[PDB]
Amino acid sequence: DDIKVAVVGAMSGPIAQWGDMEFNGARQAIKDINAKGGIKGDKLVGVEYDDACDPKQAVAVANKIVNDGIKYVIGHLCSSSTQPASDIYEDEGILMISPGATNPELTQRGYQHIMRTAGLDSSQGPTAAKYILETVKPQRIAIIHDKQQYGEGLARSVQDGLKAANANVVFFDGITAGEKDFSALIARLKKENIDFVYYGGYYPEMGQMLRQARSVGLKTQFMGPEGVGNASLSNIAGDAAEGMLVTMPKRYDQDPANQGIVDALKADKKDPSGPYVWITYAAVQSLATALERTGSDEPLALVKDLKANGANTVIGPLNWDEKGDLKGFDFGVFQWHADGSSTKA
Ligand SMILES: CC(C)C[C@H](N)C(=O)O
Protein backbone atom coordinates (compact mmCIF):
# COMPACT_ATOMS: atom_id res chain seq x y z
CA ASP A 1 0.00 0.00 0.00
CA ASP A 2 0.90 3.72 -0.08
CA ILE A 3 3.58 4.64 2.47
CA LYS A 4 2.59 7.97 4.07
CA VAL A 5 5.30 10.38 5.25
CA ALA A 6 4.62 13.66 7.05
CA VAL A 7 6.77 16.61 5.93
CA VAL A 8 6.72 19.42 8.48
CA GLY A 9 8.11 22.95 8.36
CA ALA A 10 7.33 26.65 7.91
CA MET A 11 4.84 27.39 5.11
CA SER A 12 3.98 30.66 6.90
CA GLY A 13 5.62 33.11 9.33
CA PRO A 14 8.74 35.28 9.04
CA ILE A 15 11.17 32.49 7.99
CA ALA A 16 8.93 30.73 5.48
CA GLN A 17 11.71 30.98 2.85
CA TRP A 18 13.67 28.30 4.70
CA GLY A 19 10.53 26.16 4.61
CA ASP A 20 10.24 26.74 0.85
CA MET A 21 13.57 24.97 0.38
CA GLU A 22 12.50 22.07 2.63
CA PHE A 23 9.27 21.31 0.76
CA ASN A 24 10.94 21.75 -2.64
CA GLY A 25 13.62 19.19 -1.75
CA ALA A 26 11.19 16.71 -0.22
CA ARG A 27 8.75 16.83 -3.13
CA GLN A 28 11.55 16.22 -5.64
CA ALA A 29 12.96 13.28 -3.63
CA ILE A 30 9.54 11.64 -3.27
CA LYS A 31 9.04 12.10 -7.05
CA ASP A 32 12.45 10.62 -7.98
CA ILE A 33 12.05 7.63 -5.67
CA ASN A 34 8.58 6.81 -7.04
CA ALA A 35 9.88 7.23 -10.61
CA LYS A 36 12.44 4.43 -10.01
CA GLY A 37 9.91 1.96 -8.57
CA GLY A 38 9.09 3.23 -5.07
CA ILE A 39 9.77 1.05 -2.02
CA LYS A 40 9.33 -2.46 -3.50
CA GLY A 41 6.33 -1.38 -5.60
CA ASP A 42 4.73 0.87 -2.96
CA LYS A 43 4.24 4.60 -3.51
CA LEU A 44 5.65 7.27 -1.19
CA VAL A 45 3.11 9.99 -0.49
CA GLY A 46 4.14 13.18 1.28
CA VAL A 47 1.57 14.74 3.61
CA GLU A 48 2.44 18.38 4.22
CA TYR A 49 1.93 20.17 7.55
CA ASP A 50 2.55 23.82 8.45
CA ASP A 51 3.90 24.48 11.96
CA ALA A 52 5.12 28.00 11.07
CA CYS A 53 8.34 27.32 13.03
CA ASP A 54 6.40 28.01 16.24
CA PRO A 55 6.59 25.76 19.37
CA LYS A 56 2.81 25.76 20.04
CA GLN A 57 1.74 25.01 16.44
CA ALA A 58 4.40 22.27 16.28
CA VAL A 59 2.81 20.48 19.25
CA ALA A 60 -0.56 20.71 17.45
CA VAL A 61 0.86 19.23 14.21
CA ALA A 62 2.63 16.38 16.01
CA ASN A 63 -0.60 15.48 17.83
CA LYS A 64 -2.48 15.50 14.50
CA ILE A 65 0.15 13.23 12.92
CA VAL A 66 -0.36 10.61 15.66
CA ASN A 67 -4.12 10.81 15.09
CA ASP A 68 -3.69 10.52 11.30
CA GLY A 69 -1.90 7.17 11.59
CA ILE A 70 1.43 8.34 10.12
CA LYS A 71 4.54 6.51 11.38
CA TYR A 72 7.37 8.51 9.70
CA VAL A 73 8.12 12.26 9.86
CA ILE A 74 10.56 14.39 7.87
CA GLY A 75 10.64 17.41 10.18
CA HIS A 76 10.30 19.74 11.80
CA LEU A 77 12.42 22.63 10.44
CA CYS A 78 13.46 24.88 13.33
CA SER A 79 15.01 23.79 16.64
CA SER A 80 12.40 25.41 18.90
CA SER A 81 9.53 23.71 17.05
CA THR A 82 11.27 20.35 16.41
CA GLN A 83 12.19 19.57 20.04
CA PRO A 84 8.70 19.70 21.69
CA ALA A 85 7.29 17.73 18.72
CA SER A 86 9.94 15.02 19.22
CA ASP A 87 8.64 14.46 22.77
CA ILE A 88 5.29 13.39 21.32
CA TYR A 89 6.84 11.25 18.56
CA GLU A 90 9.13 9.37 20.97
CA ASP A 91 6.15 8.58 23.26
CA GLU A 92 4.02 7.28 20.38
CA GLY A 93 6.80 5.31 18.66
CA ILE A 94 7.08 7.41 15.49
CA LEU A 95 10.22 7.90 13.38
CA MET A 96 11.33 11.54 13.10
CA ILE A 97 14.22 12.68 10.89
CA SER A 98 14.75 16.46 11.12
CA PRO A 99 16.29 18.09 8.02
CA GLY A 100 16.62 21.53 9.66
CA ALA A 101 17.12 21.53 13.45
CA THR A 102 20.78 22.13 14.36
CA ASN A 103 20.54 22.74 18.14
CA PRO A 104 22.35 19.94 20.08
CA GLU A 105 19.75 19.26 22.84
CA LEU A 106 17.46 17.37 20.41
CA THR A 107 19.59 14.19 20.38
CA GLN A 108 21.06 14.39 23.91
CA ARG A 109 18.10 13.01 25.89
CA GLY A 110 18.20 9.25 25.13
CA TYR A 111 15.49 9.27 22.45
CA GLN A 112 15.61 6.16 20.25
CA HIS A 113 13.18 7.29 17.52
CA ILE A 114 14.99 10.54 16.62
CA MET A 115 17.56 11.36 13.92
CA ARG A 116 18.57 14.33 11.74
CA THR A 117 20.33 15.13 8.45
CA ALA A 118 21.08 18.70 9.55
CA GLY A 119 24.40 19.60 11.16
CA LEU A 120 25.04 20.49 14.79
CA ASP A 121 25.51 23.93 16.31
CA SER A 122 28.07 22.25 18.60
CA SER A 123 30.23 22.37 15.45
CA GLN A 124 28.88 25.53 13.72
CA GLY A 125 29.51 27.69 16.81
CA PRO A 126 33.16 26.70 17.37
CA THR A 127 33.74 27.08 13.59
CA ALA A 128 32.76 30.76 13.89
CA ALA A 129 34.90 31.32 17.02
CA LYS A 130 37.99 29.86 15.35
CA TYR A 131 37.60 32.18 12.35
CA ILE A 132 37.06 35.22 14.62
CA LEU A 133 40.19 34.54 16.71
CA GLU A 134 42.53 33.52 13.87
CA THR A 135 41.56 35.55 10.78
CA VAL A 136 39.34 38.55 11.67
CA LYS A 137 41.18 39.43 14.92
CA PRO A 138 38.91 42.23 16.27
CA GLN A 139 39.70 44.38 19.33
CA ARG A 140 36.17 44.71 20.76
CA ILE A 141 33.34 42.17 20.34
CA ALA A 142 29.60 42.17 21.03
CA ILE A 143 27.40 39.09 20.78
CA ILE A 144 23.67 39.52 20.09
CA HIS A 145 20.93 36.83 19.83
CA ASP A 146 17.14 36.66 19.25
CA LYS A 147 16.14 34.93 22.53
CA GLN A 148 15.16 31.66 20.77
CA GLN A 149 16.71 28.20 21.07
CA TYR A 150 18.70 28.23 17.80
CA GLY A 151 20.11 31.78 17.92
CA GLU A 152 20.74 32.02 21.67
CA GLY A 153 22.38 28.59 21.65
CA LEU A 154 24.81 29.60 18.88
CA ALA A 155 25.45 32.97 20.55
CA ARG A 156 26.31 31.25 23.85
CA SER A 157 28.56 28.76 21.98
CA VAL A 158 30.46 31.58 20.26
CA GLN A 159 30.75 33.44 23.58
CA ASP A 160 32.33 30.40 25.25
CA GLY A 161 34.66 29.69 22.29
CA LEU A 162 35.95 33.28 22.35
CA LYS A 163 36.24 33.37 26.15
CA ALA A 164 38.33 30.17 26.03
CA ALA A 165 40.95 32.31 24.25
CA ASN A 166 40.23 35.31 26.52
CA ALA A 167 39.07 37.56 23.68
CA ASN A 168 37.49 40.89 24.66
CA VAL A 169 33.74 40.26 24.59
CA VAL A 170 32.49 43.67 25.70
CA PHE A 171 28.81 42.67 26.05
CA PHE A 172 26.21 39.94 25.47
CA ASP A 173 22.52 40.80 24.94
CA GLY A 174 19.29 39.74 23.25
CA ILE A 175 16.77 41.43 20.97
CA THR A 176 13.15 40.35 20.43
CA ALA A 177 12.45 38.60 17.11
CA GLY A 178 10.29 40.84 14.91
CA GLU A 179 12.21 44.00 15.91
CA LYS A 180 12.12 46.81 13.34
CA ASP A 181 14.03 49.52 15.19
CA PHE A 182 17.64 48.63 16.10
CA SER A 183 18.62 52.23 16.99
CA ALA A 184 19.27 51.34 20.66
CA LEU A 185 21.63 48.49 19.70
CA ILE A 186 23.45 50.69 17.15
CA ALA A 187 23.90 53.43 19.78
CA ARG A 188 25.53 50.93 22.16
CA LEU A 189 27.86 49.66 19.41
CA LYS A 190 29.05 53.26 18.81
CA LYS A 191 29.42 53.98 22.55
CA GLU A 192 31.47 50.83 23.13
CA ASN A 193 33.63 51.19 19.97
CA ILE A 194 32.50 47.70 18.84
CA ASP A 195 34.32 46.61 15.65
CA PHE A 196 32.85 43.06 15.48
CA VAL A 197 29.41 41.52 16.14
CA TYR A 198 28.24 37.91 16.14
CA TYR A 199 24.48 37.62 15.76
CA GLY A 200 22.71 34.36 16.62
CA GLY A 201 19.45 34.25 14.70
CA TYR A 202 17.69 34.32 11.35
CA TYR A 203 17.79 36.57 8.27
CA PRO A 204 14.90 39.05 8.95
CA GLU A 205 16.68 40.60 11.95
CA MET A 206 20.18 40.35 10.45
CA GLY A 207 19.02 42.17 7.32
CA GLN A 208 17.52 45.18 9.10
CA MET A 209 20.43 45.37 11.56
CA LEU A 210 22.95 45.58 8.69
CA ARG A 211 21.06 48.28 6.76
CA GLN A 212 20.56 50.50 9.82
CA ALA A 213 24.16 50.16 11.04
CA ARG A 214 25.51 51.42 7.71
CA SER A 215 22.95 54.26 7.50
CA VAL A 216 24.75 56.01 10.41
CA GLY A 217 28.28 54.96 9.41
CA LEU A 218 29.06 52.01 11.69
CA LYS A 219 32.24 50.34 10.40
CA THR A 220 31.45 47.17 12.38
CA GLN A 221 32.09 43.72 10.90
CA PHE A 222 29.04 41.42 11.32
CA MET A 223 28.78 37.61 11.37
CA GLY A 224 25.95 35.08 11.78
CA PRO A 225 25.02 31.39 11.41
CA GLU A 226 23.48 29.62 8.37
CA GLY A 227 20.06 30.96 9.40
CA VAL A 228 20.97 34.40 8.02
CA GLY A 229 22.49 33.02 4.79
CA ASN A 230 19.37 33.39 2.66
CA ALA A 231 18.46 35.00 -0.68
CA SER A 232 16.37 37.41 1.41
CA LEU A 233 19.39 38.69 3.40
CA SER A 234 20.79 41.03 0.73
CA ASN A 235 17.31 42.09 -0.42
CA ILE A 236 16.63 43.36 3.11
CA ALA A 237 20.13 44.72 3.84
CA GLY A 238 21.04 46.26 0.48
CA ASP A 239 24.69 47.32 0.09
CA ALA A 240 25.19 46.68 3.83
CA ALA A 241 25.20 42.93 3.03
CA GLU A 242 28.68 43.35 1.48
CA GLY A 243 31.38 41.99 3.81
CA MET A 244 28.92 40.02 5.95
CA LEU A 245 30.46 36.79 7.31
CA VAL A 246 28.33 33.65 7.62
CA THR A 247 28.81 29.97 8.40
CA MET A 248 27.02 27.65 5.96
CA PRO A 249 26.99 24.01 4.85
CA LYS A 250 28.87 22.88 1.74
CA ARG A 251 27.42 23.99 -1.62
CA TYR A 252 25.74 20.69 -2.54
CA ASP A 253 24.31 22.20 -5.77
CA GLN A 254 27.84 22.43 -7.26
CA ASP A 255 28.45 18.69 -6.77
CA PRO A 256 28.49 17.07 -10.27
CA ALA A 257 26.49 14.05 -9.00
CA ASN A 258 23.54 16.36 -8.13
CA GLN A 259 23.37 18.05 -11.56
CA GLY A 260 20.42 15.89 -12.60
CA ILE A 261 18.43 17.23 -9.63
CA VAL A 262 19.59 20.80 -10.25
CA ASP A 263 18.21 20.50 -13.80
CA ALA A 264 14.87 19.15 -12.54
CA LEU A 265 14.51 22.09 -10.12
CA LYS A 266 15.47 24.58 -12.86
CA ALA A 267 12.81 23.08 -15.15
CA ASP A 268 10.19 23.86 -12.47
CA LYS A 269 11.76 27.34 -12.14
CA LYS A 270 12.93 26.78 -8.55
CA ASP A 271 16.15 28.01 -6.90
CA PRO A 272 18.50 25.02 -6.40
CA SER A 273 21.17 26.93 -4.37
CA GLY A 274 19.71 26.67 -0.86
CA PRO A 275 21.36 24.20 1.57
CA TYR A 276 18.11 22.78 2.99
CA VAL A 277 16.81 21.80 -0.43
CA TRP A 278 19.55 19.14 -0.34
CA ILE A 279 19.54 18.32 3.37
CA THR A 280 15.77 17.59 3.13
CA TYR A 281 16.13 15.53 -0.08
CA ALA A 282 18.72 13.56 1.91
CA ALA A 283 16.31 12.84 4.79
CA VAL A 284 13.77 11.30 2.40
CA GLN A 285 16.59 9.27 0.80
CA SER A 286 17.59 7.96 4.25
CA LEU A 287 14.01 6.95 5.15
CA ALA A 288 13.64 5.19 1.79
CA THR A 289 16.99 3.42 2.11
CA ALA A 290 15.95 1.97 5.48
CA LEU A 291 12.47 0.84 4.38
CA GLU A 292 14.00 -0.79 1.29
CA ARG A 293 16.95 -2.54 2.96
CA THR A 294 15.19 -4.01 6.01
CA GLY A 295 11.81 -4.63 4.39
CA SER A 296 10.35 -3.50 7.73
CA ASP A 297 7.72 -0.97 8.86
CA GLU A 298 8.86 -0.63 12.51
CA PRO A 299 10.29 2.83 13.37
CA LEU A 300 12.88 1.39 15.80
CA ALA A 301 14.16 -1.19 13.29
CA LEU A 302 14.48 1.53 10.61
CA VAL A 303 16.57 3.77 12.91
CA LYS A 304 18.80 0.88 14.03
CA ASP A 305 19.38 0.03 10.38
CA LEU A 306 20.46 3.60 9.57
CA LYS A 307 22.81 3.90 12.58
CA ALA A 308 24.39 0.58 11.58
CA ASN A 309 24.59 0.78 7.76
CA GLY A 310 24.17 4.47 6.85
CA ALA A 311 22.88 5.80 3.51
CA ASN A 312 24.21 7.26 0.26
CA THR A 313 22.51 10.65 -0.32
CA VAL A 314 22.84 13.97 -2.18
CA ILE A 315 24.76 15.52 0.76
CA GLY A 316 27.34 12.70 0.83
CA PRO A 317 27.70 9.27 2.45
CA LEU A 318 25.77 9.56 5.72
CA ASN A 319 27.11 7.98 8.90
CA TRP A 320 25.02 8.47 12.08
CA ASP A 321 26.12 7.89 15.69
CA GLU A 322 24.08 6.20 18.44
CA LYS A 323 22.32 9.47 19.41
CA GLY A 324 21.05 10.13 15.86
CA ASP A 325 23.52 12.85 14.71
CA LEU A 326 25.56 12.90 11.51
CA LYS A 327 29.32 12.52 11.89
CA GLY A 328 31.56 14.81 9.84
CA PHE A 329 28.99 17.51 9.01
CA ASP A 330 31.20 20.58 8.57
CA PHE A 331 30.37 24.27 8.22
CA GLY A 332 32.51 26.68 6.20
CA VAL A 333 32.81 30.48 6.31
CA PHE A 334 31.54 32.71 3.50
CA GLN A 335 31.76 36.41 2.66
CA TRP A 336 28.37 37.73 1.52
CA HIS A 337 27.93 40.28 -1.27
CA ALA A 338 25.35 42.94 -2.12
CA ASP A 339 23.89 40.93 -5.04
CA GLY A 340 23.13 37.89 -2.84
CA SER A 341 26.11 35.89 -4.09
CA SER A 342 28.88 34.69 -1.77
CA THR A 343 32.46 33.38 -1.78
CA LYS A 344 34.45 31.17 0.62
CA ALA A 345 36.73 33.35 2.76
C1 LIG B 1 16.47 26.19 8.55
C2 LIG B 1 17.53 26.52 9.59
C3 LIG B 1 17.92 27.99 9.50
C4 LIG B 1 17.02 26.17 10.98
C5 LIG B 1 18.04 26.25 12.12
N1 LIG B 1 19.17 25.37 11.85
C6 LIG B 1 17.34 25.91 13.44
O1 LIG B 1 17.70 24.95 14.13
O2 LIG B 1 16.39 26.57 13.85
From Swiss-Prot:
Subcellular location(s) of the protein: Periplasm
Disulfide bonds: 53-78
GO terms for biological process, alphabetical: branched-chain amino acid transport; isoleucine transport; L-leucine transport; phenylalanine transport; valine transport
A GO MF term: L-leucine binding
SUPFAM superfamilies given in the database record: Periplasmic binding protein-like I
Gene3D superfamilies: 3.40.50.2300
CDD domains noted in UniProt: PBP1_ABC_LIVBP-like
Key words, A-Z: Amino-acid transport, Disulfide bond, Periplasm, Signal, Transport
InterPro entries tied to this protein: Leu-bd, Leu_Ile_Val-bd, Peripla_BP_I
GO CC entries: ATP-binding cassette (ABC) transporter complex, substrate-binding subunit-containing; membrane; outer membrane-bounded periplasmic space
Primary role: This protein is a component of the leucine-specific transport system, which is one of the two periplasmic binding protein-dependent transport systems of the high-affinity transport of the branched-chain amino acids in E.coli.
Family of this protein: Belongs to the leucine-binding protein family.
Protein's recorded name: Leucine-specific-binding protein
